[PDB]
Design a protein around this nucleic acid. Structure first.
Length: 252
RNA sequence: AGGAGUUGAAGCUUGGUUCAAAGAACGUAUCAAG
């Protein structure tokens, strides 16, 4: 459960507000996609365990073992720290597990809508008490004063030189500029848009950088269309980007 | 030898016909988009 997605989509006041809007609306979905897929990868598991991924929500179905509990708490700590590095209080995921017996989801004694209700109660409980003590202490201690800010992300750190737009705040605009229908999305240790756990996204087109797919170890592919099912391994991400002309003057 | 008595009376006082028609209905410049 990502909270406050709307105020991050509309955290724009600059010139390029058409591009940044579609950039952020794509970016939240793709963050939720890679976060879920990396959890399944660290759970040595296939993508069949996803019931549904939507706008800000991702419901899952895993096993009930204590090893999964340990890796779930570690995933909690890593993901929470990575958001607290990048989006200070702006974005927050609320992972809560609920346990059910195998008889309990057979629906013979009922008890399924209250499984959703209990998961909502635990999600709201973790939403009520978000950060721990040392997270708030570090988050107040890392404050500093500067004479510059970015104009969308009104934010006084991680700003580039000679120009006054924050690094995600400019990366979204650039990657929104080069984004078409048949374009491919790729993630690796070198990219443009920041994702946990330290692997970025390039979102490069069919161009001179297609040659990474040869020996693409530790590299994943997010697709709009699927044609090749040999050694391509492109999984579909559902995003709708119809564009007639992209210039409003020619359009009118 | 001329005297009187009528000095105008009645009727219609406008009738019908189209009673605002076609045009423009904001254009631009910053803002934005590229």
């Amino acid at each position: 459960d990502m909270s406050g997605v709307q105020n991050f989509i509309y955290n724009i006041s600059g010139s390029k507000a058409l591009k940044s809007l579609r950039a952020r609306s794509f970016y939240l979905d793709m963050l939720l996609e890679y976060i879920s897929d990396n959890l399944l990868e660290k759970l040595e598991l296939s993508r069949a365990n996803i019931l549904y991924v939507g706008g800000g929500h991702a419901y899952l179905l895993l096993a009930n073992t204590n090893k999964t509990k340990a890796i779930l708490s570690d995933f909690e700590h890593d993901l929470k720290t990575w958001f607290l590095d990048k989006f200070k209080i702006d974005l927050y995921v609320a992972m809560a597990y609920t346990e059910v017996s195998a008889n309990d989801l057979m629906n013979h004694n009922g008890h399924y809508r209250d499984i959703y209700r209990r998961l909502s109660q635990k999600t709201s409980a973790k939403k009520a008490n978000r950060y721990t003590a040392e997270e708030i202490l570090n988050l107040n201690h890392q404050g500093t004063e500067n004479a510059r800010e970015c104009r969308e992300c009104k934010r006084s750190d991680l700003l580039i030189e000679e120009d006054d737009i924050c690094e995600i705040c400019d990366s979204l605009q650039k990657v929104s500029r080069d984004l078409t229908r048949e374009n491919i999305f790729v993630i690796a240790n070198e990219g443009v848009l920041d994702m946990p756990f330290g692997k970025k996204m390039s979102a490069l087109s069919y161009s001179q950088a297609d040659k990474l797919k040869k020996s693409n170890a530790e590299v994943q592919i997010y697709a709009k269309n699927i044609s090749e099912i040999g050694q391509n391994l492109m999984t579909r991400i559902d995003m709708g980007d119809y564009t007639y002309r992209s210039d409003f003057h020619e359009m009118l």
